[model samples]
Target: MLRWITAGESHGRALVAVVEGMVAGVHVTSADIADQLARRRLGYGFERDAVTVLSGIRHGSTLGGPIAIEIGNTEWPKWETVMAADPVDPAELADVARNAPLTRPRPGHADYAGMLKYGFDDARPVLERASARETAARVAAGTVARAFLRQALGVEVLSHVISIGASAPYEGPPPRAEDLPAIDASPVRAYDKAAEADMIAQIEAAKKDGDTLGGVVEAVALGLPVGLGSFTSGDHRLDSQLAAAVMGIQAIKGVEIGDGFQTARRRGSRAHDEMYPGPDGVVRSTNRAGGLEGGMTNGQPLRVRAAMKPISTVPRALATVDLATGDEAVAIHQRSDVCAVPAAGVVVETMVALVLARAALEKFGGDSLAETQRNIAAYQRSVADR
Candidate 1:
């Protein structure tokens, strides 16, 4: 069973992740991991302060043992005294208290419920972990999964922004890696240049007015072998697992596979992918089902989309009640992005990678990375021979 655990506070120090149960001997490197983390830090309408805050939290380093990953806090020096993990004496609270009293809870955020669940009078603790900044660790973990997929199955996964506010969705074929740098270069991470510009304009406008916006991200897995997911049980269902992984990310409100919500309005014939023989191999003329059927992979590219809500912290604070005094006030200001869609797209990609890697190992188990590669290559050859 492939699994990973992550730990770190938003501003306390660097983020860390450990991925255990992965087969050993697969090619891995810090540059491979840093690339993903860098992508997660870019795009959207984040200010320099937000970037500096995130950057200061982690510097990258790797230990080959069980795939341990660490990101050093570049900003930890500034908050060392207040954010230190050590217990502070009561007398020091007055001098070292960094979190001021907070009463108001941000709407559409976990503040209200989290405060009640943990029986806390303030929302700072709840929001700190709930903050999307934690995704830095996820990006680190996902880089490992991506490397595994590349080495074992020769599969590739990527994410791109499909929509942002009034900006339209991206339309076209699955993007190639060469095309990715251009998408990565985009400020909004959309494929269409004109639409990206419009999305940027919308974010700028939202920032000017003290508001925030949300959008959708599309993640695609290519070159996957058929039969990675199972139809045996609900827990084994690949689509369900993928959806759960995507929804687990902060600010993700909804998830869809393939055409997603659009299939609801279409006829059965329009929704299903018809299989046909191709000169190279068996192929589906249309990928309307997004390469999944009955909870299993259908030997086609897997496509998934996640809908992310606007970030909770906004310059234009919403009306809320402070738990400390039970009085009404605008929500506390936390440095945040005007639009996080692009950064979210990178996060979604990592989530998808984790799920897909888990499913792959479940289907083809091996004791070592070399053994896993052998098993995967044999599986592909069997398909080709058939």
Candidate 2:
């Protein structure tokens, strides 16, 4: 089975990703991986070097084995003294003392739940790992598969912010895959200039009030050949996998596919995508099904959206229990952002890519990169003939 694991704390030595079941011969370099990592931190996340490969890949090629990668924290030096492994002497923990005995756990974060489950007095252990910094490794692993997909299947993925707090929606048509650079260059990763401006204004207002902000983001993937996922089993369903991915993002509370919630209020005929003849083959009059039917891709754009709640660690604290004193207290803010929808979009796009990659490998199993490309080309020819 294809599998991956990410380990390490948000402020510790480094974030690591180990991936199993990758096709051999795909060329990959730490620097190429860095390009994706850099995009992830474009308007958010901290400044840090891209990942370093530890094993599973040779000089610049996959070896039909697992891949290991790591990205050390930029704040490592400052956190080293405090996060030392050897039980520190009284004075030795001074530098790390700031994070000690975190009594006031945030209301919406994993703080209280993780602490209660682990039987810990402080929320430090939970917070350190629960922090979104861990997501960097996930993006790194996806980048590896992302590179493979581009070379073998010609699939591409991208996303942008849809709304911020009460900011107006983009309203305009979605940007094409070719427009990714422009989206990346935009301050908020939004396509509409006026809408991005309003979103920025909304963020400023929330910041001025000493409050945190939340918003919506949309991700789209193009050139996905039909039938990537399966309808035979619930576990193998593509939509289910995609939902689990974007919802995994920190602060994300909701998820939907193209016209997901909207379908609830519409007639069945109005909701389902209408099909017709096309110059080459079949065509979809609309994409209300979001490129998916019976839990598989249908040769259209794969679109999904996520709703992120305001940062749990906010400037304006919320009511909470003080674990140490067993008294009421306000939540504390160590470090955070007022808004992160733009960055969240980048993260979600990569996550969707990872899911697609997994399904692609499962459907088109191959021991080598060349074999996979050959298999895919034949499958495409068959699909086109359908």
Candidate 3:
């Protein structure tokens, strides 16, 4: 399995990323990891951050071991005095406490629940870990999985905004996979110009109102083999695994496949993708099933959508109980975005790539790139016969 863990804070000294289960001798570089990290940074609208590879690859290739990635926060020095490691006396901490202390917990954030769970007076302890800042390391880990995915199954993943707090949907036809490059570079990551305008407007409006907006992101993967998961068991189901992954992202409220809830209102004939023989193989005029059926890939473009709630922290805070005062008060405000819908897809794609990479690895097992390639080629040949 391609598993990863990220450690650190939204404003800590550094973030650590560890990627386990990669085939040996696959080429990967700092630039590769940086590219994905930059995508996330751009999608999420963050300043330039630094990344350094600590281990698991040598001379641009994997060592058949775990990969470790380290990222340094440029803002760390400024936070050192306030967010020091060893406890500081009350005299020294007076300035820190006065400036960055948290009393009110936001409505949708983990602050209140986390404080109650851990029995803490300060929300900072929980906020540091719950912050979306940790996703940088996850993005770094995804780049590793992406390298393996591209090297093994010739697979690629893309995600884009489908909505932004009720903003207009993308105009015209659904975007093809070829449109992903431009989407990655785009702030809103929507393919259509009108959609971009609407999403941008939503962000600006939220900023003006001192509010935040959230919406949906759709992730698609192309070029997967016929089957990467099983329908035999509850845990082995790909859709279940995907739902678990999408829900893992911060603020994600719901997930769906293909037409999702809308299809439930349609008749069986109109909802299912009817198969027919074609030049390549069985083809479908419609993909209402979202390229997955019975928990297995059907050799079509895989589609999954995740819905994120408005950021918990708003410029105009909502009513909540004060952690310290035990009375009703406005939630505390922190550094945050007006709308996170733009980067929503980027975060979803990180997990999508990770999940697909793990499945691909399970399908084509190998310690080295050459062996994996050989195994995949053989499988492709067999697929051709079928």
Candidate 4:
């Protein structure tokens, strides 16, 4: 099974990403990871992503071993002492405003509970790791998964913002891989032009009011083969895995597969995808099930949606009590995105890629990329004959 991990505080020296269990011979480069990093930074924000491939490749091919990468934070110089791993001199930190303890925790943030749970009085330690900047490593690790899926199975993953604030939902078909460029080019990373305009206006209004906006985004995976996941095992069920992965992202409050909640409102006749035989194969006349049935991929495009909550660090600040003083106080405000739903689409896509790759590896286990490809071909042949 594919396994990945991310480590580093939001403002620490750098973020580290590690991926293991990938087969050898898949061609990938630091530039490939760099491109995804750039896309993750495309919609709303960034600290520069400086990629360094520290291990697990040779001559541009994976070595069938654990791959590790580091994304250095260029802004590290400014927060060096404040986020230093080791203890710092009190004399050195006393006059630094950035070094002040964050006792007034913000509402809708992890600060208060995180401080209490970790047995720390300062929210800085809590907020630093809880920040969305941690997603950079996820995007970094996902790049490898994307490459493997593409090279081995011709699968492509992409995403688009569906709505922002109260903006109208984009009612178009799920986006294809080719549509990614245009989606990325849109100011709000949305697919529908009309909805993009509404999303932009809402963001502008929220910024003016010193508030924040939350919205929905959808991640789509195309070219998946049948039977990548199983129905018998709860842990191996693709939908369950996808839900957990998407929800794991910071600020993600809700998740759905396919028509999701919409399907719940429909009767049995209207809720399920109907099938018909096409010249190519068994065809799904509709995809209301979102490409999954019985918890396994059914040769249809996989679609996952995630809902991100508004950034909690509102410029106007919300009410809170000071941990140090035990008095009512306004929350500590920090510079943050007015709306992050656009960029969150990219992260959602990253999560989808990671999970699908894991499931794919499990279904077609091999130590090398060519062996994996051969196994997939054999399975396809056997499936066709049946």
lDDT of 2 by residue, 139-230 (tens): 88887777777777788888878888899877534645534643567767787778878988887887788777788888888888889889
Go through the candidates in order and give each one's C-alpha lDDT.
0.77, 0.80, 0.79, 0.87
Best-fitting candidate, scored by lDDT:
4
Per-residue alpha-carbon lDDT of model 4 for 1-386, expressed as tens digits? 79999998988988999999999998889989888898887664344545899999888899999999899988889989998989999899998999888998888788999999998899998988888888999999999899999999999898888898888888655546545654667878877778888888888888778788899998889999999789998977899999999999988999998999999999998998888887777988788888899889998889888989887578545889989989999886765678888778889989999999999899899999999999999998888876
> Model 4, which residues run further than 4 Å from truth?
44-49
Ordering by TM-score: 4, 2, 3, 1
| Residue-wise C-alpha lDDT for candidate 1, range 1-386, written one tens digit per residue | 88877777777766677787676666666777777778787785411122211211123322224576777767788667556788767566666557565557888888899999999787767876777778988888898788888888888888777888767677654555733654567888877777677788888888778778899988888988889889999989999999999999999999998888998889997888887888877778788777799898888778889999987577545778877777787876675667888888888889989999889888788856677888888888888898
lDDT (Cα, 0-100) at 167 in candidate 1: 71
Candidate 1 C-alpha RMSD relative to the actual structure: 4.0
Which clashing pairs does model 3 show?
Answer: none
Decide which is better by lDDT, 2 or 4.
4
Native-referenced Cα lDDT, model 1? 0.77
What are the clash counts of all predictions, listed in order? 11, 0, 0, 0
- Which parts of model 1 are misplaced by more than 4 Å? 45-65
**Rank order by lDDT, top first?**
4, 2, 3, 1
Residue-level lDDT of model 3, residues 98-132, one tens digit each, is 44568688888889899999997888888888988
TM-score, per-candidate, Cα-based: 0.91, 0.95, 0.93, 0.97
What does the lDDT come to for candidate 3? Answer: 0.79
